[PDB]
């Protein structure tokens, strides 16, 4: 009979507040991004570049708060963030994604984003199709907020990211997180929702590796032309590559 210990309730309380401090459900800062343009050879590039950039900053802010992440070397902190960022952004975007019309609704019509907007940032269906698919199936899981923050933290603290030096340290942090999530589903997620829930969550992480790869490929294609690359941000260029 496994129970949620003091330490695990602590972990969940930390990740919740970490999330609360880094996700603004009023989407108030959006007014500062270069404006959206819907008429267009890549008319959404500057607005979504800015949105991703912002998102990167908030993902870093959440990552810093993960129990044990601070114990990592600054070089592994960097490796974990560079390789996970797009993945965590896809997961956190789920919170604003609506099955109503397969779009991301950030408060208002100007900041409601759909398939044609991502198209206009220079992405093709090779990515968008399995991206909506992902959002749809992650939405259907109906995670408790607790499961959502833990899935994001588990994604960031992955031992097999290329370039990891203290793999064994990354593993003990992540295992302490898996264990908290597994035990959590058991104690707090009632059936039929709880059924295979963990395995389905872990499967969304595998789906993320594939989306990551395809995002990277099209980002490398986008940033071929120094003219597109001009319209990104310094943080995007540093984190996604140059």
């Amino acid at each position: 009979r496994p129970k949620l210990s003091e330490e695990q309730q602590h972990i969940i309380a930390i990740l919740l507040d970490a999330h609360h401090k880094t996700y603004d459900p009023t989407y108030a800062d959006f007014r500062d991004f270069r404006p959206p343009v819907r008429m267009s050879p890549l008319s959404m590039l500057p607005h979504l570049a800015d949105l991703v950039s912002y998102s990167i900053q908030k993902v870093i802010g959440f990552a810093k708060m993960i129990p044990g992440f601070r114990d990592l070397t600054s070089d592994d902190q960097i490796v974990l963030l560079k390789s996970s960022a797009i993945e965590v952004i896809m997961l956190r975007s789920n919170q604003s994604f609506t099955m109503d019309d397969m779009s991301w609704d950030c408060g208002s019509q100007d900041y409601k984003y759909d398939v044609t907007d991502v198209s206009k940032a220079g992405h093709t269906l090779e990515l968008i199709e399995p991206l909506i698919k992902f959002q749809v199936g992650l939405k259907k899981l109906n995670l408790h907020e607790e499961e959502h923050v833990l899935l994001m933290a588990i994604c960031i603290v992955s031992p097999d990211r290329p370039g990891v030096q203290d793999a064994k340290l990354v593993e003990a942090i992540q295992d302490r997180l898996s264990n908290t999530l597994q035990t959590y589903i058991r104690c707090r997620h009632p059936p039929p929702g709880s059924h295979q829930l963990y395995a389905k969550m872990i499967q969304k992480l595998a789906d993320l590796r594939s989306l990551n790869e395809e995002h990277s490929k099209q980002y490398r294609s986008l940033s071929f032309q120094p003219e597109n690359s001009m319209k990104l941000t310094p943080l995007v260029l540093e984190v996604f590559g140059n």
């Binding site: 900053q57 870093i60 802010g61 810093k64 601070r70 600054s74 902190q77 960097i78 963030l81 560079k82 310094p234 943080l235 540093e238 984190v239």
Partner: peptide, 12 residues
């Protein structure tokens, strides 16, 4: 050297 901005956002 070569991730200044990311490094700075990570700092305590």
């Amino acid at each position: 050297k070569n991730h200044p901005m990311l490094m700075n956002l990570l700092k305590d």
